[PDB]
């Protein structure tokens, strides 16, 4: 996020980090329940990648994070890689996340839900702070 | 990438207004946000765009793509969750 601010730790409990086997953070995700994560199709997640729940400071070894294995990757069949449209993948976890004060689910909207232009929303992540 | 989690508040735009920046790349299953002095950027992909509805945070967008330089004056493009929810529920239900 460019020009964002540090969040209060544990305050966005559905936010997960998608890391590869080398431990490199490559994409974020959101817990929708204990066994499922939603992320972007273009992240190219494989079952060799890990979902890290409960983390605030990735430079810290004393946080009680949950490193969860991915059982199955469900790329939306409508995803179009040429236009990046319908950019959603669901990850089914092999081990359920354990909900706590720092690990919990975000709600999903109704198909019929209305979110108006002008509404102030929030976005979170560990992406670049500068380009 | 930063070590600690970042956050930012940013406004939703309409698709019509987004098209002014992005043109025909903006599809129905996309939603834009930002162009407000902040921007999602590389490594943010896949993460949430949440809006408070009736007191609870709701997933409205999934960080997707935008400016190659993460420009704070151009809107970021997010996957529009309301257009994809039916697929999520069908998926969870069958698995």
């Amino acid at each position: 996020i460019v020009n964002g601010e540090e969040a209060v730790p544990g305050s966005w409990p559905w936010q997960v980090s998608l890391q590869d086997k080398t431990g490199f953070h490559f994409c974020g995700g959101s817990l929708i329940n204990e066994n499922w994560v939603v992320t972007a199709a273009h992240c190219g997640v494989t079952t060799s990648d890990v979902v890290v729940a409960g983390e605030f400071d990735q430079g810290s070894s004393s946080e009680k994070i949950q490193k969860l294995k991915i059982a199955k990757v469900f790329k939306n069949s409508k995803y179009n890689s040429l236009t990046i449209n319908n950019d959603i993948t669901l990850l089914k976890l092999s081990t359920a996340a354990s909900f706590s004060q720092t690990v919990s689910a975000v709600c999903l909207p109704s198909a019929s839900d209305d979110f108006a232009a002008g509404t102030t929303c929030v976005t979170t992540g560990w992406g670049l702070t500068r380009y | 990438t930063p070590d600690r989690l970042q956050q930012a508040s940013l406004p939703l735009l309409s698709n019509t207004n987004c098209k002014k920046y992005w043109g025909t790349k903006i599809k129905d299953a996309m939603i834009c946000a930002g162009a407000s002095g902040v921007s999602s950027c590389m490594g943010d992909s896949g993460g949430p765009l949440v809006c408070k509805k009736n007191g609870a945070w709701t997933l409205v967008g999934i960080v997707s793509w935008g400016s190659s330089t993460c420009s704070t004056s151009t809107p970021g493009v997010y996957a529009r969750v309301t257009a994809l929810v039916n697929w999520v529920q069908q998926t969870l239900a069958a698995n």
Partner: peptide, 4 residues
């Protein structure tokens, strides 16, 4: 443009 670019993916994120």
């Amino acid at each position: 443009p670019g993916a994120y």
